[PDB]
Enzyme design. Sequence first.
Site, mmCIF file in Angstrom:
data_model
loop_
_atom_site.group_PDB
_atom_site.id
_atom_site.type_symbol
_atom_site.label_atom_id
_atom_site.label_comp_id
_atom_site.label_asym_id
_atom_site.label_seq_id
_atom_site.Cartn_x
_atom_site.Cartn_y
_atom_site.Cartn_z
ATOM 1 N N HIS A 183 0.809 -1.211 0.000
ATOM 2 C CA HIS A 183 0.000 0.000 0.000
ATOM 3 C C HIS A 183 0.846 1.266 0.000
ATOM 4 C CE1 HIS A 183 -3.550 -2.202 -0.052
ATOM 5 N NE2 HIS A 183 -4.142 -1.812 1.062
ATOM 6 N N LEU B 58 36.750 -32.072 27.245
ATOM 7 C CA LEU B 58 37.600 -33.239 27.439
ATOM 8 C C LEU B 58 36.824 -34.327 28.169
ATOM 9 C CD1 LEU B 58 40.407 -34.437 27.045
ATOM 10 C CD2 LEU B 58 41.069 -33.435 29.240
ATOM 11 N N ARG C 216 32.703 -18.781 23.794
ATOM 12 C CA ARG C 216 31.678 -19.481 24.560
ATOM 13 C C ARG C 216 30.316 -18.820 24.397
ATOM 14 N NH1 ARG C 216 33.471 -22.789 28.631
ATOM 15 N NH2 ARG C 216 35.369 -21.511 28.591
ATOM 16 N N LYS D 195 37.480 -31.865 35.905
ATOM 17 C CA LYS D 195 38.714 -31.868 35.136
ATOM 18 C C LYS D 195 39.860 -32.286 36.048
ATOM 19 C CE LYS D 195 40.416 -27.863 34.077
ATOM 20 N NZ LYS D 195 40.537 -26.520 33.445
ATOM 21 N N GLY E 9 34.741 -23.922 33.628
ATOM 22 C CA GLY E 9 34.131 -23.539 32.365
ATOM 23 C C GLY E 9 32.649 -23.856 32.314
HETATM 24 O O1 RK3 Z 1 36.634 -28.345 32.071
HETATM 25 P P1 RK3 Z 1 36.428 -26.878 31.985
HETATM 26 O O2 RK3 Z 1 36.669 -26.039 33.189
HETATM 27 O O3 RK3 Z 1 34.966 -26.584 31.409
HETATM 28 C C1 RK3 Z 1 34.366 -27.590 30.573
HETATM 29 C C2 RK3 Z 1 33.755 -26.971 29.342
HETATM 30 O O4 RK3 Z 1 34.790 -26.266 28.625
HETATM 31 C C3 RK3 Z 1 34.959 -26.796 27.314
HETATM 32 O O5 RK3 Z 1 36.036 -27.698 27.241
HETATM 33 C C4 RK3 Z 1 37.238 -27.326 27.921
HETATM 34 C C5 RK3 Z 1 38.288 -28.420 28.153
HETATM 35 O O6 RK3 Z 1 37.775 -29.728 28.232
HETATM 36 C C6 RK3 Z 1 39.229 -28.147 26.996
HETATM 37 N N1 RK3 Z 1 40.534 -28.777 27.117
HETATM 38 C C7 RK3 Z 1 40.903 -29.978 26.565
HETATM 39 N N2 RK3 Z 1 42.146 -30.297 26.832
HETATM 40 C C8 RK3 Z 1 42.641 -29.260 27.613
HETATM 41 C C9 RK3 Z 1 41.636 -28.307 27.792
HETATM 42 N N3 RK3 Z 1 41.795 -27.178 28.506
HETATM 43 C C10 RK3 Z 1 42.963 -26.963 29.063
HETATM 44 N N4 RK3 Z 1 44.020 -27.851 28.936
HETATM 45 C C11 RK3 Z 1 45.323 -27.828 29.431
HETATM 46 C C12 RK3 Z 1 45.947 -28.963 29.005
HETATM 47 N N5 RK3 Z 1 45.062 -29.696 28.257
HETATM 48 C C13 RK3 Z 1 43.868 -29.019 28.208
HETATM 49 O O7 RK3 Z 1 39.367 -26.756 27.054
HETATM 50 C C14 RK3 Z 1 38.030 -26.223 27.210
HETATM 51 C C15 RK3 Z 1 38.103 -24.897 27.922
HETATM 52 O O8 RK3 Z 1 38.752 -25.051 29.205
HETATM 53 P P2 RK3 Z 1 37.829 -24.794 30.485
HETATM 54 O O9 RK3 Z 1 36.623 -24.032 30.051
HETATM 55 O O10 RK3 Z 1 38.655 -24.252 31.601
HETATM 56 O O11 RK3 Z 1 37.400 -26.289 30.864
HETATM 57 C C16 RK3 Z 1 33.652 -27.519 26.991
HETATM 58 O O12 RK3 Z 1 32.681 -26.736 26.332
HETATM 59 C C17 RK3 Z 1 33.158 -27.983 28.359
HETATM 60 O O13 RK3 Z 1 31.742 -27.951 28.412
#
Ligand code: RK3
EC number: 3.2.2.5
Lengths: 473, 473
Positions: free
Chosen positions: B151, B325, B368, B385, B396
């Site tokens: 319109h 992880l 995130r 963890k 996290g």
């Molecule tokens: O467990 P959180 O506290 O929270 C868990 C959430 O976070 C995310 O996955 C994590 C973590 O699995 C991944 N990760 C894998 N391998 C390593 C690592 N981080 C630090 N590293 C040091 C040496 N090797 C590692 O890095 C993400 C960030 O680290 P954060 O957020 O601190 O992990 C997901 O979405 C999950 O839901």
Amino acid sequence: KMNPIVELFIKDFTKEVMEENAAIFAGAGLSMSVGYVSWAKLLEPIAQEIGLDVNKENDLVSLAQYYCNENQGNRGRINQIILDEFSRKVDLTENHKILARLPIHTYWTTAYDRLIEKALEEENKIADVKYTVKQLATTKVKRDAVVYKMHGDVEHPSEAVLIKDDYEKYSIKMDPYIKALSGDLVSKTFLFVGFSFTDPNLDYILSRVRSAYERDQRRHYCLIKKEERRPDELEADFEYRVRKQELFISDLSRFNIKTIVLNNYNEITEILQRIENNIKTKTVFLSGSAVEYNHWETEHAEQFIHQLSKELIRKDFNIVSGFGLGVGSFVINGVLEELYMGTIDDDRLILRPFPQGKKGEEQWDKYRRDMITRTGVSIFLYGNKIDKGQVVKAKGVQSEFNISFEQNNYVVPVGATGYIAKDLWNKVNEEFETYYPGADARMKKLFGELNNEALSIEELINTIIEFVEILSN
Amino acid sequence: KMNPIVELFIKDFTKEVMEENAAIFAGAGLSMSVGYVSWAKLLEPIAQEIGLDVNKENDLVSLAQYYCNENQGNRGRINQIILDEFSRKVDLTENHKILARLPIHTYWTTAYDRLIEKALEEENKIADVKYTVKQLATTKVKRDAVVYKMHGDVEHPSEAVLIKDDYEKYSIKMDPYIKALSGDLVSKTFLFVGFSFTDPNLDYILSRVRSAYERDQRRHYCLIKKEERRPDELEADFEYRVRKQELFISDLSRFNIKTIVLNNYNEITEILQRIENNIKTKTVFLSGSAVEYNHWETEHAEQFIHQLSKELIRKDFNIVSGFGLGVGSFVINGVLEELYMGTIDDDRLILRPFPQGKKGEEQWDKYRRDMITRTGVSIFLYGNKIDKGQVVKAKGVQSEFNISFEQNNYVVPVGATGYIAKDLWNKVNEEFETYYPGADARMKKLFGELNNEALSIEELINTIIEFVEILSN
Ligand SMILES: O=P1(O)OC[C@H]2O[C@@H](O[C@H]3[C@@H](O)[C@H](n4cnc5c4ncn4ccnc54)O[C@@H]3COP(=O)(O)O1)[C@H](O)[C@@H]2O
Ligand SMILES: O=P1(O)OC[C@H]2O[C@@H](O[C@H]3[C@@H](O)[C@H](n4cnc5c4ncn4ccnc54)O[C@@H]3COP(=O)(O)O1)[C@H](O)[C@@H]2O
């Protein structure tokens, strides 16, 4: 006499009809005075079935559509209602008869009844009625008028345009009728009678014609009655309705349709009668036979008749003469002088000499009646023949006067010419109101002056011409 | 919950929108709650100039046409009125914002204001606004939705469809828009909001589509508020209005347009919110990280996560995972098992592994937030963890939960998994009404059962699935 607007419309539309370029668009309102009950009254049980009230509803098309929706789209009840109502035998109104008598070759109707067809039939006119797309492909031979029933016929209720579905599918199903109506609206001068201009199809067609032709649309006419104060309504509501109608009238001009506002619905009949009279009185029946021309000499009277006929032809009158002895040759000479300036048009001069002998006199009466029927004004001059060597007042002129009166034709006896003309003038003056009801002062003065022997040729001819013109115009 | 008819409409229209085959037809009524004064109020001085009263008039198009007729067809006053009124700065209503947030790529509007355009702009969406025939020939690149202002626009008052002349010339001037709307009506599922279905152009287009497609017309939806008893009106008049509205609703069905009758106009907002929630909650954010799987063994918990992800994919949910992880691999395996029956559809599984290193942790928060924004339901599992050789509850997952709450996402912490998931479940149960206002008994029972360690894999998975489904459906 009527309003000056009405007089101008009458003149213009008489001019249009005499050219045979005028069409009549008749709505349902033209058939509401005949005896058919109102469509709202018919839909009242229909409205009650679906729980509505027809008095509270203004859009009856939507009401019928709602009824069909409540019945899975079935139209049997509405078809039966319209077939029962609009197929009844009703006496024709005066409007239909006048319209049939007019030389109008095109009718467009939104009414389902056959009143226009019956009016044309009762006038011994061949009517080509069209309400189907196929019927457009065939034309009746020697037809006088064609009637387009654009909303269907009463005898075919299932094809009548009543519900919103019909209006929505009209542009596809009945497209040839839309094209024909557009062509008529651009090529013919329409008069809308009984039409409320609330029809979606007509609005669509008018909008298309307007979009196509801008400000160069052909002028059409409509007749609309003014708003009347209802008993329950107040003054403010009546004034509001009047203003609403005025705004409605200007929007119509948006389509170059001039509206004539009428006080009542009988003014439609009055206007139609005036147009019919204007068309009919343009043909004058010149009568008379003269061996002795009363006081005037032979040559003087011959010149008078010649110039009278020349003036009649010049004033756009069609002369019908019986070729009486002593009058016929000179009216013929006047017509020839007026026209040879050329050929003799069949309409301008119709000559009907009487057959001579015993066989002719048997059919002389029917011949005279047929000759007079073509005219609307009768002019009588002299009326004297020779039987046994002496001037005797004729008897054929008296029969012509009687036939003219029986046909409601205007009679103009010139008493200055004497003999049967003087006798007829005296008879008319004896009962003037019977022959000229509601005559004005000028008409009476002219009629009285018609019997003056002191007038010259020019003065008498001018008096006759003015009398005939005020009779016609 | 709303009426079962409303629930069926919500399900069907959510299904239509998720397929991106839904269009929105917005009338002027959708903008009458924003703050714009009524069109009758604007025409009130217009009606008073021509001697009419806008309150006594229902056809405002004819009122504007009468005003233009009284001014030789000039529209300057009406153009100025609409430009002054509908170009004002008004805060967007919730309906426009919800419609902008929905994945709807086609809007058709009879309103002159730019509220839909502003709502689409405030959602960072590219809107291709069309109100001119020429504009149909150009398409914006990467446009999210196209708005057909059929319109006219507020910034072009002279081309707005307001008077009867505009409606009459619309079929010629704006024929491409008629063709486009017919194509959309036959190819898309429309929702009519704020439309009274009294527009001659829409009636014409719907009648053409019906004539073309008979009983095979596509189903469309309209939202209409029920009639309310006016203070001055009586019971009989209210019942008559209700019956009239019911008949109006069946007539629309004649065009295969199903009408949803609403008690008030806020139910439009409620329905839009429900559709938006149904669309948004179909994407679930799977969160968690686990080195020790609480009471369950490693293999048992891996199988549980795998089957949970398989059920989520099977229940038509789109999984978004951060690849935590210990949880990411097994949800990936579940999605692969559910889908390889094949390729990985980008919508079904969105994987966002976190960058590793000092540079990644700087943008970890925005990463995130962007990851969570794609979802409407957050599911938390475990949350443990390893930092210095000992199992420590993760941080996290807590940030994820905070982001999910800030985005008004539904949170489903599974307390049986323990750790941060159990802490979050306890926090939610501490204030249950804050996170789940107006929750039913079944929802409370499922939330309580979410923290049961005696459930098997199948029982816990079924509880989670049912909770997420009652959140979504
Ligand atoms: O467990 P959180 O506290 O929270 C868990 C959430 O976070 C995310 O996955 C994590 C973590 O699995 C991944 N990760 C894998 N391998 C390593 C690592 N981080 C630090 N590293 C040091 C040496 N090797 C590692 O890095 C993400 C960030 O680290 P954060 O957020 O601190 O992990 C997901 O979405 C999950 O839901
Ligand atoms: O005069 P009138 O009474 O009435 C006059 C009216 O009639 C018609 O003309 C007359 C008349 O002029 C014509 N006519 C011509 N020549 C003869 C003759 N009739 C008989 N004859 C016997 C011998 N020779 C003739 O025959 C028409 C019929 O005869 P009538 O009607 O008796 O004639 C006009 O229309 C005129 O208006």
